[PDB]
Design a protein around this ligand. Structure first.
Ligand code: ZN
Lengths: 80, 134, 28, 55
RNA sequence: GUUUGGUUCUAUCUAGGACCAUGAUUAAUAGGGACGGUCGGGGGCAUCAGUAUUCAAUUGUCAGAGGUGAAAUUCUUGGAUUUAUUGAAGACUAACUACUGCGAAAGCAUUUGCCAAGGACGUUUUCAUUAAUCAAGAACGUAGGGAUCGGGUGGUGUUUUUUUAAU
């Protein structure tokens, strides 16, 4: 309602849009996933836009969706 | 209208969880280019293959200048070629069945939006002039 | 009240501590 | 056979439910990772043999 | 950044000559373009359906049927109206239908498929001012709050369910 138009509360900046803040920036994180077929690691975007495939055994990692892409139910991930 | 766009962050360097070299990204993008893929598709397949943000950040320059440096330049730019492809596709559909008056309207609009960009490209002279959409 | 009707980890934030968002020499 | 179906269902629903909650909260990997499970899937053996079948 | 061409100089490894295929930072909550899950009674072409309406055939029984404020005209024992079983024809899409959806506008409601297109969202993808405004021409004909539709994020209960895919 009535806040400082300089640096606001971190809850408020995480509340509002990623364009409407002071310094706009991303809200998609890069995450590393462990391929369950051959247990290696690869990097993948959050809003993945494409069915990414492992280089060792190209099974599947994430079917793309509109927003975040669904990780494919055997994969183990970590944010980074 | 509405806003829906990327928000490139405030940093301007490789995001330091990167564990990969610089010329390997160059080899990857010339490999996808010799496979025959358009630059925007190189950009998204590089966002998702190995964790780059974009090539102006991770390499020394943008993919258009790095592909002109590696000798795989496009003879016409991306938006020009894609509007030409959309124009010829809707022209082929209208010549399949001429009753589509909405496709006639959209062909007129795509012709206008491609002649605007052709005017820009001729006035900046990056394609050879006399180029006026056949 | 709607959001607290849903969620489970929501602190009853006191009005007398609503405005403080940071203190050097945190606690003794 | 009534006491047989009673005893067999009594141990089976117990082991099924504990396997279901065990795969529903199996968050920790030894190196940082979080296993994606999918909704209402009942077994780690089930997702393991599914990801073996999807090769 | 060439494919080759040719020279000599160490104890098969090396040195020094020439030809042959490239144009300044930021990425506007300015703009157009890619991509993705979608989204709509948006469009074009086929296709499917519904019971109506009219007409025809075949049954059935008998003096009226129609129409209006009253009538009248008309039709009717060669069976009008009504009933039942069908068959054909074109047009339209009852209820669902709302202060909801789409399209530049007029307008747009059955199903299914094809053909393209479009919008919003998502985006750490690309281009780098490409923008706006309209004669001529062209195609078609002051601030605040609640709710809802489309998309996305997070939460964590019921609907859901589980090794077939989907989400
Ligand atoms: Zn693997």
């Amino acid at each position: 309602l009535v806040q400082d138009l300089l640096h606001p509360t971190a809850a408020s900046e995480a509340r509002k849009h990623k364009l409407k803040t002071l310094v706009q920036g991303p809200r998609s994180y890069f995450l590393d996933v462990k391929c369950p077929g051959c247990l290696n690691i690869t990097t993948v975007f959050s809003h993945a836009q494409t069915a990414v495939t492992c280089e060792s055994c190209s099974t599947i990692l994430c079917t793309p969706t509109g927003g975040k892409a669904k990780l494919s139910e055997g994969t183990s991930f970590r944010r980074k | 209208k509405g806003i829906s766009s990327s928000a490139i962050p405030y940093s301007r360097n490789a995001p330091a969880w990167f564990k990969l070299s610089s010329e390997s990204v160059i080899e990857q993008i010339v490999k996808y280019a010799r496979k025959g893929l358009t630059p925007s598709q190189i950009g998204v397949l590089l966002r998702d293959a190995h964790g780059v943000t974009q090539a102006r950040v991770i390499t020394g320059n943008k993919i258009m200048r790095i592909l002109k440096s590696n000798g795989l330049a496009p003879e016409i730019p991306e938006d020009l070629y894609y509007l030409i492809k959309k124009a010829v596709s809707v022209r082929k559909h209208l010549e399949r069945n001429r009753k589509d008056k909405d496709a006639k309207f959209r062909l007129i609009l795509i012709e206008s939006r491609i002649h605007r960009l052709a005017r820009y490209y001729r006035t900046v002279a990056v394609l050879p002039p006399n180029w006026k959409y056949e | 009240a709607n959001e607290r009707r849903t969620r489970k980890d929501m602190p009853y934030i006191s009005e007398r501590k609503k405005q403080i968002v940071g203190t050097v020499h945190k606690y003794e | 056979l009534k006491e047989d179906i009673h005893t067999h269902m009594a141990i089976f629903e117990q082991r099924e439910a504990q396997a279901q909650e065990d795969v529903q909260s199996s968050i920790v990997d030894e190196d940082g990772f979080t296993l994606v499970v999918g909704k209402n899937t009942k077994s780690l053996n089930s997702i393991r043999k599914k990801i073996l079948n999807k090769n």
